[model samples]
Target: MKKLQIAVGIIRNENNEIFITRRAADAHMANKLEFPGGKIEMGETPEQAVVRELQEEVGITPQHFSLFEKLEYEFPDRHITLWFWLVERWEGEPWGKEGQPGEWMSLVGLNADDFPPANEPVIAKLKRL
Candidate 1:
C-alpha cells in the first residue's frame, strides 16, 4: 500500500493545554480524539501543510511552530507517515472550524485510549514533557 503523508499540529497554549478534536463519526478513526491535521498536498512541505491544515480545520494560523517528530504507522487498510508539529504560538484561538468537537486539555491529562493507535507514541512523548 502507498503511504500517505500527513501533517499534524499539536497546538499548545500558555497554560500548558493542548488542543484536540474528535474525528467525525463517519470518518476514519471515528470519534477518536486527535490533534488537528490533514494530508500533505502535492508540492507542499510538511510545515506548510500543517499551517494550512490548522487554519482550515482549527481556525488558527501558527505564529511559531516546528517539527516535533515524524513517525510511520500501519493500519489494516492504510499506511501513513505522520509529521507532528509543535505549535507553541498562534494568531487566533483554536476551534473546530469544520464542525468537529474540539477542546483543550492538560498535556498530562491526555488519555491514549481516546486516540487512534498511531497517536500512542506522540501522546506518550507529550506526557513526558
Candidate 2:
C-alpha cells in the first residue's frame, strides 16, 4: 500500500469562520467537506505544501499558519498522514478556484459527520475551542 503525505489547512477569516470545500464528485471521498489542501510535492515541506495548495485550491495565500495537529489513518486501500495547520492570517479571499464548492462555515455548530472520517478528531478538537 502507498502512503501519502497531505497538508491540510484550517483557514479562518476575521469572523472566525472556517473555510471548507466539497470534494469533486469523482474523487475518492466524493461530496465530503474538506479543508483546502493537497499532497506535499517532492522537495517541499508540509508548510510549503499547505501554502501552495491553499493558493491553488482556494485562491488564498497563507501569510500566517502553524501546524496544529498531525495524524495518520489507514484506509482499506491506502495510508495517509495529514498535517493539519491553523491558517490564522492570509491574503486574498477564499473561494474554490478549482471549480469545487466552497464556503466559510461557522464552527459553532459544525458537524464532523459532514466531513471524512479522518477529519472527525480534528473537528472535535476545534469544537473545544
Candidate 3:
C-alpha cells in the first residue's frame, strides 16, 4: 500500500514543552495525540507543509524553527512521512482554530501511548535534542 506524506510540527514554548492536540474520534488518527500540521501537498516542501499546517490547524506562525527530523511509518490505510520541527519562536497565540483542543506538556511527560505510533520517534528525537 502507498503511504500518506504528512508533515507535523513540534511547537514548543519558552518552557521547552511542545504542543499536542487530541485527534477527534471521527478523524483518521482518531483519539491519538499529535503535533499540529498535516499532509504535505503536491509541490510543497515538508517545511512549507509544516508552516502551512500550523496556520491552518493552529493559529501561530513560527518566526523560526529547526528541522529536527523526518519519520516514516506504515499503517493499514496510511503511510506517513512526517517532518518534525522544533519551533523556537513563533507569532500569536494558538487557538483551537482547527477545532481540536491542544495541550502543552513537558517532554518527559509524553508516553508512547500519548501520540500516534508514527509520531513517537519524532518525540524521542525531540527529547534527545
Candidate 4:
C-alpha cells in the first residue's frame, strides 16, 4: 500500500472553541473547511510539521500542546497516516495568515456539514471527549 503524508491540527481553547480553516478557492480542495493543517514535508516528523504549519498557516506559535491520536485513513488513491495533537495553549491569536479564513468556533457549530470529511471523525471524537 502506498502512503500519503499529511499534518493537521486539533486545536482546543479554554472556551472549547476549535480552530479551523477553509481551503482557498483556487486550491485543489477549494471551499472545503478543514483543520489548520496540511501536507507533511520530507525530513520532518508529523508533530514538528504540524507545529510549523500552525505557525505558518494560522500564525500560531505553539506555547504548549499534546498528542492525542494517530489515525490511518485510506481514501481513493491516498493512504494517509495522520498525527493528531491538541493545541491546548498557543502564543498568538490564530489568523488565516495563509490566506484562508481562520475561525474559532463553538463545538455546537462544528458539524460534518461544516468541515471536510476527514475532519468529521475528529469533530465527533472531540464531542465525545
Which order, best to worst by lDDT? Answer: 1, 2, 3, 4
Comparing 1 and 2 by lDDT, which wins? 1
Question: What lDDT score belongs to each candidate, Candidate 1 first?
Answer: 0.91, 0.91, 0.81, 0.77
User: Looking at model 4, which ten-residue stretch has the lowest summed lDDT?
Assistant: 113-122
Model 4 segments more than 4 A misplaced = none
Candidate 2 lDDT, 62-102, residue by residue in tens: 97688888999998888999999999899999987999999
Q: List ranges where model 3 is wrong by over 4 Å.
A: none
TM-score of 4: 0.86
lDDT of 2: 0.91
**Model 4 lDDT per residue over 62-113, tens place:** 7567766678877666688777787788888888896778788887677776
| Alpha carbon lDDT at 62, candidate 1 | 88
Model 1 ranges off by over 4 Å: none
Model 1: lDDT to the true structure:
0.91
TM-score of 1: 0.96
Q: Which ten residues in a row have the lowest lDDT in candidate 1?
A: 60-69
Tens-digit per-residue lDDT, 1-129, candidate 3: 676778777888878777888899998879888888888899998878888888888888876788888767888886777777878788878778977889788987788777888777767767786
